[PDB]
């Protein structure tokens, strides 16, 4: 896949959590998981094209966390081949470094306290995993080789049985 996974960044981005972890919204504005979505409320339902499936995580056709209803967030394709993303505030980890990671998904090693329900926005479960769905390839054409698996996620107290594609 051209110039998307070639030099995006290593999956082991440097820097760790120097201390407490809080919320942040850098208004960052997605071939690779090194991205930051933005919280978007009311939107003009004119240029949106194709499915609008959003990740609960359980995909379902002003997003909010399952504890507060709504959904974590989602992405869409619209206009002339442009991808847009949205979701809860991009989770950030308190630390130091030239390229400190603003975790948009689960990231254990770089920070011990980061659970998806509290530190994830989009469909990235782990840096090398995705929640498969019919338009997954339509949205992330760089992830064809990933192998499918079946997983159980306990969000709050609700158990979700879903298939996830991860590299191996």
């Amino acid at each position, epitope marked *: 896949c051209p110039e998307r996974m070639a030099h995006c960044r290593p999956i082991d981005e440097f820097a760790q959590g120097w201390g407490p972890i809080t919320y942040a919204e850098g208004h960052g504005s997605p071939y690779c998981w090194h991205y930051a979505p933005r919280q978007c409320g009311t939107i003009p339902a004119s240029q949106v094209c194709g499915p609008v499936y959003c990740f609960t995580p359980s995909p379902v056709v002003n997003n909010t966390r399952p504890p507060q209803g709504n959904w974590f967030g989602c992405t869409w394709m619209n206009s002339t081949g442009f991808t847009k993303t949205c979701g809860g505030p991009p989770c950030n980890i308190g630390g130091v470094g030239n390229n400190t990671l603003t975790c948009p998904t*689960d990231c*254990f*090693r770089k920070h011990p306290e980061a*659970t998806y329900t509290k530190c994830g926005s989009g469909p990235w*479960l*782990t840096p090398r*995993c995705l929640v498969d769905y019919p338009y997954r390839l339509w949205h992330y054409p760089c992830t064809v080789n990933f192998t499918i*698996f*079946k*997983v*159980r*996620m*306990y969000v709050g*107290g609700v*158990e979700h049985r879903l298939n996830a594609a*991860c590299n*191996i």
Partner: antibody
Amino acid sequence: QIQLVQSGAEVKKPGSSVKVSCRASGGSFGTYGITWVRQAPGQGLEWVGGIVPLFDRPNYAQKFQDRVAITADESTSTAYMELSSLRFDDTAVYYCAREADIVVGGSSYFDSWGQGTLVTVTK
Amino acid sequence: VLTQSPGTLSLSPGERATLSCRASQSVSSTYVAWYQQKPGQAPRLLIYDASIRATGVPDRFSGGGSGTDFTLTISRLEPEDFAVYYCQQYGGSPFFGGGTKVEIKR
């Protein structure tokens, strides 16, 4: 399904650490969780911890938190369990097990166990 | 949260025995697994979900339950059925149960 569960610290001293190991021969390491369950000499089996070496987020039972660290090394196909703050009650045998299906935040049922290793805490 | 009613138990071959594991408060969404420990060997799996049998085990060991009081019926006992049977519930609240004893020396 061949577990070479390492005999670790057979004899220890109170307050010290123990570093037990388990190895999964064959198959494809990185798709099935390794689960550690202990049992005292005569007692019931108590869940201790578990890991799934693809979603790096080991789970521990509520009463075994901040005191147990479970790690896995994909390169060598080895799951280590480091148990700290030993007490005279810890005298037990710590088995190894496989999780039938991957779990994130939960557990599962142990399909194929491994050899039980004795870890005696004495002074 | 989970306990076994019968406590100790002793019988002779060709008998029917019942063991009951109590799901205290939550229905738990039908998650159960039963083990069998011999006097020194590692435990082995017999049932999971309380309704599906494992591979390599005879039909003698049965499963059943709906909501609460999952059961493990041991009919037509044999000399090779001396073991301290164990109960656990998995899912979101993994916690083993109590160990009912069994004696086949009769």
